[PDB]
Each structure stands twice: as structure tokens, then as C-alpha cells.
Design a protein around this ligand. Structure first.
Ligand SMILES: Nc1ncnc2c1ncn2[C@@H]1O[C@H](COP(=O)(O)OP(=O)(O)O)[C@@H](O)[C@H]1O
Ligand code: ALF
Ligand SMILES: [Mg+2]
Length: 422
DNA sequence: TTTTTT
């Protein structure tokens, strides 16, 4: 069962009427495991969300965007074009009106506009414009030393800097109206059988330069990616694409190319997957959409066992079952354009963003062009249970590590067990 | 740079 610190956080959150809680702690402390106990306690009263397909599946929930039907773009502060309440007799309206608890996992990855849009979407649907989250009890779980929210450099960064001052969930204006009670987990459950590896991760989290050189001497193994049962992580999509292409090319099976059908407007680069996707029998893949029948999920890893122009059979890693995947129609709505493609991507290599929240048997980090996101390295290192399960393509220099002053201000302030934005 | 999608 639950550890004594998970049990203490479980009781602190469930026994009080206080409507805003944050359960935070280092990687693998058992936050999502506590989230499963919270789901058994609240059952139907709670909706569980997470910012990524991976984190949502790990949390036995849904992405924030698929639940609220938010567009995959910047969500302007309380903007009616971006934040639309559901229809008068829709299944989403009923779900929002009846909800008592919102469980939000991997909150560190939740961008400020996404959290603010959740607040406003709840207040509008529930017709409670003066109550944060429309009276919904909010249980946030995550870690600000793991991946920072994704901020494209142009007009999105400007808008965020002008509206919130920064992109972090804790910079949301909702926190001026409600105090966030903070509960902590400290004990590594993922690395519990390797205590020196748990301590090395702790020193790396604290930016210790000696722990980095120790990590480099022990874990640098350029051939680490070629070993069976290893998942490769890369900072970039184009880096993962090159490593996936090489594995696909080595497979003996006849290739089959899947040309996406693009109709109407539908802008390039967005595009939820590649327009000309090549697959073979034996290819390692990741599923990009939840089955409307509930047999597979966005984030499911698997292997292609059969393939044809309009269908493929995928053996799932999660349950050892075969599922039949047909092309999916992504519709750009203002229904200006469509993008029809099989909702699959190659997955011998994935971005570090797609691994956050997972416990992996074996990981190899391919540095490529380098680290660009705060918490990116830390996420890659902390996916495994033991040091021997981790390998790096090259040594990492101390100059590659990132500092986020806004994260440090938040982390210092929550030491008091509360977050109250001025 | 990366995420969300429809
Ligand atoms: N109380 C516990 N007892 C045993 N194993 C646990 C416990 N809590 C977590 N774990 C395991 O440790 C790993 C990391 O837990 P997880 O909840 O995913 O951590 P986090 O969400 O904090 O990163 C998982 O393999 C999980 O099953
Ligand atoms: F904090 Al985690 F997997 F959710 F390390
Ligand atoms: Mg987790």
C-alpha cells in the first residue's frame, strides 16, 4: 500500500474542505501512485487530467485539451474565441456541472494559459464567475524541477510575458483568489532498490557539479541505445525521427507508406503527425488518439503485426492485446480543413517530453544538438530504477544546466506549506 | 527547439 508520507498527503487532502492542493516532490516519489488512491476515494466525483498524452495515460485520465475541447494553440486570458463553454445538452456540460474534484497530474508541464483556461471554462459552464475553478476542488500533482511548459519564441512568449509575466502554472492570476496548500513527498519509490542512485539524482536535482562528473564517468555509453529493451530519448522530434528511420530500415519486412489526405486550409507543421509515414511489420510505435471504443489510448506503445492501406494491427505493450487502427480525421474548426492519417508515430526513440511520468526498464539519452529545456535532463535520468538501466550518448558539461529564477522563487516560498500569489 | 489537437 501507500507509504507513510503518501498516506499523510492522502489524509491532508481528503479530510479538509480546503479547495486547492498541490502535492509536489522529486521524480519517482510516488505522486501518480497517490493519485490512484485519490481516484479510488473520489471515483465518479473526480475528473483526472494531465497536459500530455503520456502523462494522461499514466494518470488513467485524459489530456486537458481533449476533456475541455480546447484548441491546440495559445489560450488568451478569458478570451471567448479560445475558451468556449459546452452546449446546453452536451455530455461535456453534464460532466463539468456534476464534477466535484479535478485531479491535475504533471502540473509543472501545465502552461499558465492552460491552467487559467481551465479556471475560466469551469466558472462559465458552472455559472460561478466569482469562485475559483467554479467551486471544483482542485488536486494538483507534479514537480517544477521536471520539464517547464512549452513556450514558442515569437508572439506566444510576448503575450505570456505581458499577461502573466511568465509561463508557469503558479503564475496564474487564479492564485491571487485562492491559497494553494502544499504537501510534500521526499522518498524515492522508483529508485528505492538503488539508494546511491536515488542520492545521485538528489544531488543532480540540487545542481551538484561533482554528481554530474560522477554521472558522466558511470553512465556515458555511446552504444547504450542498441541494446534490447531500451527506449531512446532525444531533446528534439527530428533527432527521434533519424533514430526511428534507422531502426525501420533494419527491419526485413516490406515497407508500406501512409500518405495523409489533406483537404482545405489545414496549415503545415501542425499536422499532428507526418504526412508521409512509412511502416513495416515489427515497427515500434506510439498511438496518438484514444479509441472512441476505449480499447487503446493516446500514449499507448506497441508493435505493428499487420498492415494495409486503410488498417494496421498493433500489439500493445500495456496489455499484450492486438488492436486494429484505422486512419483518423483531424478537423480544423473555426470545419475549414481536414488531415486524415493513421494515428501512429515511430517510437524506438521519443522526445524527453513524451517520457515524463513514465517508469522505464532501460533508457538511453541521445543528446543530439543539446538540452534546451529546464528540467529536460533531470526527467531523462529519473525514468529508471537503477543506475545500470541508464546510459548517455556523451558527457554533459555543467554549462548545459538551466536556471529558472521564477521556479526558485516559487520553491522557496512553498517551503512554508502554502502558495499565495500577490 | 518542446506540448496540446481537430
Ligand atoms: N508506496 C509505494 N510502494 C511501492 N512502489 C511504489 C510506491 N509508490 C510508488 N511506487 C512505484 O514507484 C514508481 C514511481 O512512482 P510514481 O507514482 O510514478 O512517481 P511520480 O509520479 O512521483 O514520478 C512506480 O514504479 C510506482 O509503482
Ligand atoms: F514525477 Al514522475 F514519473 F511523475 F518522476
Ligand atoms: Mg507521476
Amino acid at each position: 500500500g501507500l507509504s507513510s508520507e503518501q498516506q499523510r498527503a492522502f489524509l491532508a487532502v481528503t479530510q479538509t474542505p480546503h479547495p486547492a492542493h498541490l502535492i509536489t516532490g522529486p521524480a519517482g516519489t510516488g505522486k501518480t501512485t497517490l493519485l490512484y488512491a485519490l481516484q479510488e476515494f473520489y471515483k465518479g466525483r473526480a475528473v483526472t487530467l494531465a497536459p500530455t498524452g503520456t502523462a494522461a495515460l499514466q494518470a488513467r485520465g485524459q489530456t486537458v485539451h481533449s476533456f475541455f475541447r480546447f484548441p491546440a494553440r495559445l489560450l488568451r486570458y478569458r478570451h471567448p474565441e479560445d475558451i468556449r463553454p459546452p452546449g446546453p445538452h452536451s455530455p461535456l456540460r453534464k460532466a463539468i456541472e456534476q464534477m466535484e474534484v479535478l485531479i491535475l497530474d504533471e502540473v509543472g508541464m501545465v502552461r499558465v494559459d492552460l491552467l487559467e483556461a481551465m479556471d475560466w471554462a469551469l466558472r462559465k459552464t458552472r455559472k460561478r464567475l466569482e469562485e475559483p475553478f467554479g467551486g471544483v476542488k482542485v488536486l494538483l500533482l507534479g514537480d517544477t524541477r521536471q520539464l517547464e511548459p512549452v513556450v514558442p519564441g515569437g508572439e506566444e512568449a510576448l503575450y505570456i510575458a505581458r499577461t502573466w509575466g511568465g509561463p508557469f502554472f503558479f503564475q496564474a492570476h487564479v492564485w491571487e483568489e485562492v491559497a494553494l496548500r502544499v504537501h510534500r513527498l521526499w522518498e524515492s519509490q522508483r529508485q528505492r532498490e538503488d539508494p546511491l542512485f536515488a542520492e545521485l539524482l538528489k544531488r543532480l536535482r540540487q545542481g551538484d557539479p561533482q554528481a554530474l562528473e560522477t554521472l558522466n564517468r558511470a553512465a556515458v555509453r555511446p552504444d547504450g541505445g542498441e541494446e534490447p529493451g531500451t527506449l531512446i530519448l532525444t531533446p528534439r522530434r527530428k533527432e527521434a525521427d533519424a533514430l526511428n528511420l534507422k531502426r525501420l530500415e533494419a527491419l526485413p519486412g516490406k515497407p508500406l507508406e501512409y500518405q495523409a489526405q489533406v483537404k482545405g486550409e489545414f496549415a503545415e507543421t501542425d499536422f499532428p503527425t507526418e504526412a508521409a509515414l512509412t511502416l513495416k511489420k515489427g515497427a515500434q510505435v506510439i498511438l496518438l488518439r484514444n479509441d472512441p471504443l476505449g480499447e487503446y489510448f493516446n500514449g499507448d506503445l506497441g508493435w505493428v503485426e499487420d498492415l494495409e492501406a486503410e488498417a494496421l494491427a498493433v500489439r500493445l505493450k500495456r496489455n499484450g492485446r492486438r488492436v486494429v487502427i484505422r486512419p483518423f480525421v483531424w478537423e480544423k474548426i473555426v470545419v475549414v480543413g481536414t488531415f486524415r492519417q493513421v494515428p501512429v508515430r515511430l517510437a524506438w526513440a521519443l522526445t524527453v517530453h513524451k517520457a515524463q511520468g513514465l517508469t522505464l526498464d532501460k533508457v538511453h539519452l541521445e543528446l543530439g544538438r543539446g538540452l534546451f529545456a529546464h528540467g529536460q535532463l533531470y526527467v531523462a535520468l529519473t525514468r529508471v530504477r537503477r543506475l545500470q538501466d541508464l546510459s548517455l550518448s556523451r558527457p554533459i558539461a555543467p554549462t548545459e544546466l538551466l536556471w529558472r529564477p521564477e521556479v526558485e522563487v516559487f520553491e522557496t516560498r512553498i517551503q512554508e506549506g502554502i502558495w499565495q500569489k500577490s
